Design an enzyme around this catalytic site. Structure first.
Site, short mmCIF file in Angstrom:
data_model
loop_
_atom_site.label_atom_id
_atom_site.label_comp_id
_atom_site.label_asym_id
_atom_site.label_seq_id
_atom_site.Cartn_x
_atom_site.Cartn_y
_atom_site.Cartn_z
N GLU A 255 45.53 4.79 77.23
CA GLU A 255 44.18 4.35 77.68
C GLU A 255 43.11 5.32 77.14
O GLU A 255 41.94 5.17 77.55
CB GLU A 255 44.09 4.25 79.20
CG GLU A 255 44.77 3.01 79.75
CD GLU A 255 44.83 2.94 81.26
OE1 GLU A 255 44.11 3.71 81.93
OE2 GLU A 255 45.61 2.11 81.76
N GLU B 40 41.55 9.94 85.99
CA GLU B 40 42.68 9.03 86.32
C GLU B 40 42.85 8.07 85.14
O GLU B 40 43.20 6.90 85.37
CB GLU B 40 42.34 8.36 87.66
CG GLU B 40 43.42 7.47 88.25
CD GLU B 40 43.04 6.91 89.62
OE1 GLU B 40 43.96 6.48 90.34
OE2 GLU B 40 41.84 6.90 89.96
C1 LIG Z 1 45.26 4.37 87.62
C2 LIG Z 1 45.79 3.48 86.54
C3 LIG Z 1 45.28 3.59 85.26
N1 LIG Z 1 45.73 2.81 84.30
C4 LIG Z 1 46.66 1.91 84.51
C5 LIG Z 1 47.23 1.72 85.77
N2 LIG Z 1 48.23 0.76 86.02
C6 LIG Z 1 48.68 -0.11 85.08
O1 LIG Z 1 48.25 -0.14 83.95
C7 LIG Z 1 49.74 -1.10 85.39
O2 LIG Z 1 50.89 -0.77 85.19
N3 LIG Z 1 49.43 -2.34 85.87
C8 LIG Z 1 48.02 -2.73 86.09
C9 LIG Z 1 47.75 -4.02 85.30
C10 LIG Z 1 48.70 -5.09 85.82
C11 LIG Z 1 50.13 -4.65 85.48
C12 LIG Z 1 50.50 -3.33 86.16
C13 LIG Z 1 50.72 -3.52 87.65
C14 LIG Z 1 50.74 -4.70 88.33
C15 LIG Z 1 50.99 -4.41 89.69
C16 LIG Z 1 51.12 -3.08 89.78
N4 LIG Z 1 50.97 -2.53 88.55
C17 LIG Z 1 51.05 -1.09 88.34
C18 LIG Z 1 46.77 2.54 86.81
C1 MTA Z 2 42.08 2.95 85.31
S1 MTA Z 2 40.77 3.79 86.13
C2 MTA Z 2 39.87 4.18 84.67
C3 MTA Z 2 38.38 4.21 85.00
O1 MTA Z 2 37.70 5.08 84.10
C4 MTA Z 2 36.55 4.42 83.58
N1 MTA Z 2 36.28 4.96 82.23
C5 MTA Z 2 37.10 4.88 81.17
N2 MTA Z 2 36.54 5.50 80.10
C6 MTA Z 2 35.35 5.98 80.48
C7 MTA Z 2 34.26 6.73 79.84
N3 MTA Z 2 34.35 7.09 78.54
N4 MTA Z 2 33.18 7.04 80.59
C8 MTA Z 2 33.08 6.69 81.89
N5 MTA Z 2 34.04 6.00 82.53
C9 MTA Z 2 35.18 5.63 81.90
C10 MTA Z 2 36.89 2.94 83.61
O2 MTA Z 2 35.73 2.10 83.64
C11 MTA Z 2 37.73 2.84 84.87
O3 MTA Z 2 36.91 2.63 86.03
#
Ligand code: A1AAS
Ligand code: MTA
Ligand code: CL
Lengths: 625, 310
Positions: free
Chosen positions: A432, A423
């Site tokens: 990310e 995810e």
């Molecule tokens: C599973 C996952 C992995 N990476 C990023 C996200 N989501 C966001 O990065 C994102 O867009 N965010 C979160 C950080 C605050 C701003 C904005 C947000 C505020 C309320 C709802 N959201 C969506 C979800």
């Molecule tokens: C937005 S949800 C992303 C999740 O993946 C985890 N994550 C991101 N990169 C790594 C990695 N290299 N190894 C283990 N967990 C990770 C982060 O700590 C977060 O909980």
């Protein structure tokens, strides 16, 4: 319901008048602060030495009333851009006098006319005023959707109204605004009070105004038709505009006399409140993201940083996304263990970045739906979340789930995996570092293993928002590059903005990536056919991802997964706005770049003019490995 | 003072019109202070104005008066800030002034009115850019015309034709009207677009000619027939707010301005008289029907000056 005010150019007693309009149902009143017809001389005697007072006393209302209920209007004799030297100079002094008095009262807003092409000296005086003392009163520029000259009746025999197509000619009203706002260096205190006439222009002209800072819409009593019973109402076209202006949460201003004489004014107003309470109510998404409209945020880096408990809380509070993940695994389980094998074959399934374990739960709901057996690893590096996994695991999951507390790039796995499930997607898919993370983990996937997701693709689309360009500009910080704020992406619920072209794909990643020499860097040239006149302020980023086969997530507005609120769009700004004419192609170039330590985006507009290359060597913005 | 006549007359005198019988009409607005309004005053004694005690009649209007004109002998037609044209009927004994009609038809200040040669109809001009033609008998708007692209400065009915009037606007156009044509308006005026027009007076006899003053203090004599600007002079240092032709068989042109000066001019626009007696803006003039060499001016300095014009 609506916030609305009354525009009068006549107020005999400020006390009684304000009483009437409160009684009618109005929230505020636009009135002159000096008598409209009370022209004043500042240089030539004797008129210069006219005995005062110059206007009525500030004691006539409470400071509270002035601050909240009164919008000032510039006196209509004040013409700073007169061709007559003597009138220029009086209007220069008279404007400062009226603005300085508005400031003295603490008025929250003050109306100024944009009603000709040349407002150079007007901009000069206002810009000068804005930089004298400090107040934070708002300046509403009164601009007509259609110039008064292009709205006149065709009744001058020797000067007829040219019945030809003029694409730009009938947009001049926006160029008036654009030039004025540009002269005032995009001051955050200068907004638009957009004046609507009986004949709406063409949709594309109403489309110029889309991304502009509209604080008010002015409705003259004229434009209102009359229904059978006798009440006032609006054409189906005027109504579409209102429904649009309501989603932009503008304030409505009623101006001119009552032309529906067998009713109170609170009929004109009642009709807006009818129109307001009669719109398609806010869907799950619009309700969720209701306070975030055009609010800039730093994009999360869940690799470089440890996400807070309440961040994981919102990721998890999104059922539609986890249903898709559930279905994708369910389908993958069935395409991997045949029915005859169902009690001979335990699939080894690894969650990579498990957080507090919403995917671990989906993976269990998956297997107890497809009736197949699974062994779960939950790899998570954020030890704060790992506390939550191990409490869950001890309390409910049992031995089925092994919680691993390490980086998936470092972890040495006892056995190889059938399915890795992640995810790790940002608002721009790969932002990310899902690629780098899953690359480092694919060695412990079986030589025939599935990744969920298998594919993600980022999308770019050029936008116009003189509003968002200002929110970025407003992010300058001491002790860094004064232009750093423009060389970095922001996550934001883009709201007040204009999409100048359909989104095209930018960067695509496949998992697993079997390529012998894996390179996660990229160069992508994009050409955006633009069929309107406008100004470029940045590029909206979205993404789609294939979890498994025909199970997909998207934030691409066209294909947007309905009722899924885990991601807002990303915004890539540009330092200097770029004029784009109808027919011109916007060409943007995006690079994904990398070290051992950092990953980042450089980007540049190459057509119709070139920009500076944004964020060279990730100087302003990097993403930590 | 008479019954229902205000105790105090508002500072800023806007209008000054003599009736045929020698009585003086005054309109006045309050342009500053708590209460922004106006008033109408009949002075059978023209030498006792502005004084509120020795007046025949007076009344309070809801709002300020921008322009004023007699309808015949008993009728008073008023351009209100309110967006209304109001018609005030005079009493039998001529001791009070009563509202006959008050119609809110314009959407901004009504800046100018003029009665058409018949006397059954008037045309108004407003800051809402509209020009309207009224039936004073029926108390309704017959015609509504958006000819202009800017607030209407001045509308002047032709002396003798009930379907013709000049208008002028901050859109720089002087418009010759004729409600008989299906496109009623016709843009005339000088070769090159010059300085904005601010005032209009028809010649009282040569029905084919008129004068217009501009915001640069330049009065201009024009032929519609010749439709080419024969003559002009730099009379004033500032905006020309009013032009008034004398009642003589060969008439004089009184010129009142924001440079607080009155001028009186011959038919070739050379200077015969000038007066500084006003120390605020000069807002109107009417010539005495009784003494053709007496002229009356009013200012924002609350002065009513009477001039002996050689
Ligand atoms: C599973 C996952 C992995 N990476 C990023 C996200 N989501 C966001 O990065 C994102 O867009 N965010 C979160 C950080 C605050 C701003 C904005 C947000 C505020 C309320 C709802 N959201 C969506 C979800
Ligand atoms: C937005 S949800 C992303 C999740 O993946 C985890 N994550 C991101 N990169 C790594 C990695 N290299 N190894 C283990 N967990 C990770 C982060 O700590 C977060 O909980
Ligand atoms: Cl931020």
């Amino acid at each position: 319901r609506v916030s609305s005010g009354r525009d009068l150019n006549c107020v005999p007693e400020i006390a009684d008048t304000l009483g009437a309009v409160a009684k009618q149902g109005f929230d505020f009143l636009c009135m002159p602060v000096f008598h409209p017809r009370f022209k004043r001389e500042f240089i030539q005697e004797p008129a210069k030495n006219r005995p005062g007072p110059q206007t009525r006393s500030d004691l006539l209302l409470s400071g509270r009333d002035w601050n909240t209920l009164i919008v000032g209007k510039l006196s209509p004799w004040i013409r700073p851009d007169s061709k007559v030297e003597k009138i220029r100079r009086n209007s220069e002094a008279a404007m400062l006098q009226e603005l300085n008095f508005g400031a003295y009262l603490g008025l929250p807003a003050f109306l100024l006319p944009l009603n000709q092409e040349d407002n150079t000296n007007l901009a000069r005086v206002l810009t000068n005023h804005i930089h004298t003392g400090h107040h934070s009163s708002m300046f509403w520029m009164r601009v007509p959707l259609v110039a008064p000259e292009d709205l006149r009746d065709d009744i001058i025999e020797n000067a007829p109204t040219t019945h030809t197509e003029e694409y730009s000619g009938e947009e001049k009203t926006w160029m008036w605004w654009h030039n004025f706002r540009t002269l005032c260096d995009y001051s955050k205190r200068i907004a638009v009070a957009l004046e609507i006439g009986a004949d709406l222009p063409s949709n594309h002209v109403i489309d110029r105004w889309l991304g502009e800072p509209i604080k008010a819409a002015i409705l003259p009593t004229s434009i209102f038709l009359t229904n059978k019973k006798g009440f006032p109402v609006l054409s189906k076209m005027h109504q579409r505009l209102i429904f649009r202006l309501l989603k932009l949460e503008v304030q409505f201003i009623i101006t001119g006399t009552n032309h529906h004489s067998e009713k109170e004014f609170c009929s004109y107003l009642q009709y807006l409140e009818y129109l307001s309470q009669n719109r398609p109510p806010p869907n799950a998404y619009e309700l969720f993201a209701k306070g975030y409209e055009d609010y800039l945020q730093s994009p999360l880096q869940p690799l470089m940083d440890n996400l807070e408990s309440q961040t994981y809380e919102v990721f998890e509070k999104d059922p539609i996304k986890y249903s898709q993940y559930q279905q994708a695994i369910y389908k993958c389980l069935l395409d991997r263990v045949p029915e005859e094998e169902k009690d001979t074959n335990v699939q080894v399934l690894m969650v990579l970045g498990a957080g507090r374990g919403p995917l671990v739960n989906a993976s269990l709901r998956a297997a107890k739906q497809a009736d197949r057996r699974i062994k779960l690893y939950a790899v998570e590096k954020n030890p704060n979340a790992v506390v939550t996994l191990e409490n869950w695991q001890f309390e409910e999951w049992g031995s089925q789930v092994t919680v691993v507390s390490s980086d998936m790039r470092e972890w040495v796995a006892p056995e190889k995996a059938d399915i890795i499930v992640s995810e790790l997607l940002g608002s721009f898919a790969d932002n990310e570092l899902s690629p780098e993370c899953l690359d480092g983990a694919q060695h412990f996937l079986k030589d025939d293993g599935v990744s969920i997701p298998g594919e993600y693709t980022s999308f770019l689309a050029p936008i116009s928002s003189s509003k968002l360009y200002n929110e970025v500009r407003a992010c300058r910080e001491k002790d860094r590059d004064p232009e750093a704020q423009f060389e970095m992406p922001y996550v934001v619920r883009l709201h007040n903005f204009h999409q100048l072209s359909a989104p095209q794909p930018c960067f695509t990643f496949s998992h697993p990536n079997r390529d012998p020499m894996i390179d996660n860097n990229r160069y992508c040239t994009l050409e955006f056919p633009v069929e309107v006149n406008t100004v470029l302020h940045g590029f909206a980023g979205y993404f789609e991802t294939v979890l498994y086969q025909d199970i997909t997530l998207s934030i691409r507005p066209e294909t947007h997964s309905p009722g899924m609120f885990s991601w807002f769009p990303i915004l890539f700004p540009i330092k200097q706005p770029i004029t784009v004419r109808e027919g011109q192609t916007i060409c943007v170039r995006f690079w994904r770049c990398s070290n051992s330590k950092k990953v980042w985006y450089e980007w540049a507009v190459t057509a119709p003019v070139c920009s500076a290359i944004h964020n060279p060597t990730g100087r302003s913005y990097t993403i930590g490995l | 003072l008479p019954p229902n006549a205000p105790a105090c007359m508002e500072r800023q005198l806007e209008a000054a019109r003599y009736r045929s019988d020698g009585a003086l009409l005054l309109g006045a607005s309050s342009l500053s202070g708590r209460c922004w309004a106006g008033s109408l005053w009949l002075f059978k004694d023209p030498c006792a104005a502005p004084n509120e005690g020795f007046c025949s009649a007076g009344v309070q209007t809801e709002a300020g008066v921008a322009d004023l004109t007699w309808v015949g002998e008993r009728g008073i037609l008023v351009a209100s800030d309110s967006g209304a044209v109001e018609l005030w009927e005079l009493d039998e004994n001529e001791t009070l002034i009563v509202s006959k009609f008050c119609k809110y038809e314009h959407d901004d200040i009504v800046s100018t009115v003029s009665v058409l040669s018949s006397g059954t109809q008037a045309v108004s001009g407003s800051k809402d850019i509209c020009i309207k033609v009224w039936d004073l008998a029926q108390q309704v708007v017959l015609s509504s015309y958006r000819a202009h692209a800017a607030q209407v400065t001045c509308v002047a009915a032709s002396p003798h034709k009930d379907s013709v009037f000049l208008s002028c606007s901050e859109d720089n156009r002087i418009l010759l009207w004729d409600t008989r044509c299906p496109k009623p308006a016709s843009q005339i005026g000088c070769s090159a677009p010059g300085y904005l027009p601010t005032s209009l007076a028809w010649h009282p006899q040569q029905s084919e000619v008129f004068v217009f003053g501009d915001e640069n203090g330049t009065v201009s004599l024009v032929d519609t027939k010749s439709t080419s600007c024969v003559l002009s002079s730099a009379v004033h240092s500032q905006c020309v707010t009013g032009l008034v032709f004398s009642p003589h068989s060969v008439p004089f042109l009184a010129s009142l301005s924001e440079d607080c000066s009155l001028a009186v001019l011959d038919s070739s626009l050379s200077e015969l008289f000038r007066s500084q007696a006003h120390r605020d803006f000069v807002r109107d003039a009417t010539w005495s029907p009784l003494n053709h060499s007496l002229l009356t001016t009013v200012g924002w300095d609350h002065q009513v000056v009477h001039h002996v014009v050689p």
